[PDB]
Amino acid sequence: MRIAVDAMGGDHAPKAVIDGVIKGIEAFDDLHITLVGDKTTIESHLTTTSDRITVLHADEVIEPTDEPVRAVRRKKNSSMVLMAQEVAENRADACISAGNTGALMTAGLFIVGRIKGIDRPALAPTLPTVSGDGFLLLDVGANVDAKPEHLVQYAIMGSVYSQQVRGVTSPRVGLLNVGTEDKKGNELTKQTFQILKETANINFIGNVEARDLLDDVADVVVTDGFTGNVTLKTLEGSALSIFKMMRDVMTSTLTSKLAAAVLKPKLKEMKMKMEYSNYGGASLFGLKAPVIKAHGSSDSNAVFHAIRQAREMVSQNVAALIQEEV
Amino acid sequence: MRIAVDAMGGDHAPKAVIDGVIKGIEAFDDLHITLVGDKTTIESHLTTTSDRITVLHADEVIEPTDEPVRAVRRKKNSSMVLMAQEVAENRADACISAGNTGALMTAGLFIVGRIKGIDRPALAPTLPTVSGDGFLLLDVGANVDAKPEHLVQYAIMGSVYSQQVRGVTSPRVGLLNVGTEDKKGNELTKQTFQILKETANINFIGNVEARDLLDDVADVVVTDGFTGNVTLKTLEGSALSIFKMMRDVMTSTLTSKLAAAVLKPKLKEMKMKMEYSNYGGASLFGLKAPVIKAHGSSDSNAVFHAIRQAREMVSQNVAALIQEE
């Protein structure tokens, strides 16, 4: 098993990405990593662990302010393009980048290519729940204009991932909607509900309301890329607001000074919702191989969990199973 | 000022509705309330004797499972329909119900009627922000399938409300979107962006991302009913979920004890988070009179704030001002 990793994308790149790669190499014996980026810089951090790591030099990098299609086509020697090329030329089974989301989706689509029978890829992060089981939200902005058939394919891919990678035997697939009632939604959502109702290979549990997303309402929640993107950003801003209010309550002068016992829980609280990177990162479903967008602020542990998820996606043959299921 | 209130709709109706009405009557000297529902049941809960509370008997009620059009047409003597008829016959200036949302919107459309020039009314609640300035979100589910023209009308109505009732001189109008760039959004949203940019009567500041809604990115935030409903419900349910997740962190005897010291400020925090507290209910902009949908789980405090918001809406002539635009 070979995974190509973009060493240059991300806020803490390249150090955090390299440190996560070293953690994955130490954890999984069968794993081979191709680290793509500035070779000499990458080698500077690799002085203690270099066993199953190959370093592939990339002269250029894609910056966050550049337009994705132009950057991917023009900068053939960027770390992201060379990383995707490793997968396309069959020198890697999966790839991971913490870089620009749009650039990675462009490179995945243009270079890695779609699974046969898959119309449009979907961006799918695993989000937290109160129980800690988590759930898959797909499509959070890979495809803004969606057809009902696209959403049906999203449900199938999310079900295969939830079964093979998360080990959920019969994943509950819900359709994000304005109500729990069967006939709710706009045209796209109602047409999708009717097709989902007739889709044999999934455990379709119906419409799910947004208010219940974090309450373990479903294992897979399906939506179009625009609504999903808006939903994910709403979740992020809500998490920041509540953390801010809690920090004010736990650090206020009006409260007991002894309740300073509580200062240390602030970090734990920030961890519980803000960082869902422990779940692995946003997968681009529908491509010929696993392509994973690691969060831009990924530290070494986040990179490690993205590696662990990509490894399971490869070993459990998710792409081939998706091809068969459609 | 007279407001007709549906005493029968809502999870904690009729006790919470009657108690909220009594709180409004005690807070506002000028307020007259017509309580619509079963006279004997209402009189059981009436702890007050006040000439400014009148009881209007309604033989039937529209249940949460009833179909909106069919129930509204069939149940002519329901509390919701009689409440709306009070507004239509000019025996009340506004009405409030915590009952079935689809039924209430249908009654508003059928009985109260739309302002001339408005194709579709919108469901518009006021949400809190970090600064305390607040912002108006619309449409949050009156019409799930919207055209660009409908969103333009939502921007005009929201701006009028923000200026006249909320005292914002030049309301900043943002289009809820996935990016700041002009070409962002799905087909409906980018088309709306171009029309909104060419719209004369508004201060359009462009696209706004959902992550900044609570940080005063805009005074008025415009979306279609499907996306707006999903956004609003995400905010409410997620605030409850995340608060529960963070509170779970403090469970150990020393941390339980430390948490109980902060218990009074966090009950205060939960109250401050409830968005039926910060404003009343979602107002239906575009009808001839104010019709307010209070949250189905409204307690007395939520009912009261719905009354206070309806009172501000009547006093500032928003229906007339929206019509002028």
User: CA B277, CA A161: separation in Å to the nearest integer?
Assistant: 41
- Across the interface, whether the CB atoms of A237 and B226 are under 8 A apart is answered no
Total domain count for chain A? Answer: 1
- Quote the CA–CA distance of B217 and B56 in Å, as a whole number: 44
Tell me if residue B78 falls in helix, strand or coil. Answer: strand
Q: What is the dihedral of CA A73, A78, A79, A83, to 10 degrees?
A: 40
E strand segments, chain A: 2-6, 32-37, 53-57, 94-97, 122-124, 126-127, 135-138, 172-177, 203-209, 220-222, 282-285, 291-293
Cis peptide, bond prior to residue A248, ω within 30 of zero: no
Q: What is the DSSP letter of B279?
A: S
Q: A176: which chain B residues are within 8 Å (Cβ-Cβ)?
A: 230
DSSP character string of B163-205: HHTS--SS-EEEEEES-SSTT-S-HHHHHHHHHHHT-TTSEEE
Subunit contact A144:B237, Cβ cutoff 8 A: no
Return the bridge partners of A140, or none: none
CA-based nearest residue to B97, from B64, B135, B48, B70: B64
Provide the phi-psi class of A147: left if phi over 0, else alpha when psi is between -120 and 50, else beta: beta
User: Contact, B283 vs B318, CB < 8 A?
Assistant: no
Token couple for B265: 């400020």
Q: Which two tokens stand for residue B222?
A: 């415009």
Chain A residues whose CB is inside 8 A of the B132 CB are none
Residue of B268, B246, B174 lying closest to B216 (CA atoms): B174
Structural domain that includes position A67: 1-326
* CATH code (residue A64): 3.40.718.10
Interaxial angle between packed helices A148-164 and A318-325, expressed in degrees from 0 to 180 and rounded to the nearest 10 = 140
Q: Give the dihedral of Cα atoms B45, B47, B53, B57; nearest 10 deg.
A: 30
Cα–Cα distance for residue pair B7/B18, rounded to 1 Å:
7
Burial of B169 from C-beta contacts in 10 A (0-12 / 13-18 / 19+): exposed
- B284, two tokens: 């239906």
Going by their DSSP bridges, the two strands A32-37 and A53-57 should be labelled as parallel
- Beta strand A2-6 with A32-37 is parallel
Phi/psi of residue A9, nearest 5 degrees: -75, 145
d(CA A297, CA B239): 23
**How many angstroms separate the first and last alpha carbons of chain B?**
25
Our measurement of the distance from residue A301's CA atom to the centroid of its chain's CA atoms, rounded to an integer in Å, reads 15
The answer to whether the Cβ–Cβ distance between B246 and A242 falls below 8 Å is yes
- Angle of helix B225-248 relative to helix A225-250, nearest 10 degrees, comes to 40
Contact A231, A223 (CB under 8 A): yes
**C-alpha closest to that of B125 among B104, B139, B146:** B139
How far apart are the two ends of chain A, measured CA to CA in Å? 26
Method: X-ray
CB B219 within 8 A of CB B162: yes
Of B139, B150, B74, B144, residue with least CA distance to B107? B74
B105 residue type, one letter: M
Separation of alpha carbons A310 and A1, rounded Å = 10
List of chain A residues whose C-beta atoms are within 8 Å of the C-beta of residue B262:
249-250, 255, 259, 262
Contact B186 A224 (CB under 8 A): yes
Count interface pairs A-B at CB distance under 8 A.
161
Whether residue A14 contacts residue A321, with contact meaning beta carbons closer than 8 Å, is answered with no
Cβ atoms of B314 and B164 within 8 Å: the answer is no
B178, B237, B239: residue with CB nearest A230:
B178
Using an 8 Å CB-CB cutoff, list chain B residues near A252.
265
